[PDB]
Amino acid sequence: VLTESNKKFLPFQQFGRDIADTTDAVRDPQTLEILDITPCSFGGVSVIT
Amino acid sequence: AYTNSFTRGVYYPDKVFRSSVLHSTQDLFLPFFS
């Protein structure tokens, strides 16, 4: 899920990576703006019976 | 002559951003106090 980011990228910086080597912030090639990256919601499913 | 480079010649190694983290990189650097 994208989201506008207040993050600062240097002019040569296009991808901001995570601890697990995953991009958690990107810069759109067309418009030079920084977008926040977040994997969609997930979780276990427990059935109570 | 000679002089001491205390903590000079440190740059950003890669084209990636990081925040509030300590990162370790192997790259051509200027040794401290050289």
Quickly give the structural class of chain A. Answer: mainly beta
Helix fraction of chain A by DSSP (H/I, runs of at least 4): under 10%
**What fraction of residues of chain A sit in β-strands?**
25-35%
SSE order of chain A: EEEE
Greatest interface by residues involved: A-B, 12 and 7 residues
Can you tell me the overall shape of chain A?
elongated
Q: Give the end-to-end Cα distance of chain A, rounded to a whole number of Å.
A: 34 Å
Instruction: Enumerate how many helices of chain A there are, as a single number.
Output: 0
C-alpha Rg of chain A (nearest Å): 15 Å
What is the strand tally of chain A?
Answer: 4
User: Order of strands across the biggest sheet of chain A?
Assistant: 1-4-3-2
In this structure, how is the largest beta sheet of chain A organized? 4 strands, antiparallel
Assembly context of the chains: part of a larger assembly
Describe the structure.
The structure is cut from a larger assembly and holds 2 copies of chain A. Chain A is an all-beta fold. Chain A has no helices and 4 strands. Chain A has strands spanning 3-4, 15-17, 23-27, 34-36. Chain A has a 4-stranded antiparallel beta sheet with strand order 1-4-3-2, with no helix packed on it. In chain A, strand 3 (23-27) and strand 4 (34-36) form a beta hairpin. The radius of gyration of chain A is 15 Å and the shape is elongated. The interface between A and B is small, with 12 and 7 residues. Chain A: It comes from Severe acute respiratory syndrome coronavirus 2 (2019-nCoV). Chain A: This is Spike protein S1. The PDB classes it as viral protein.
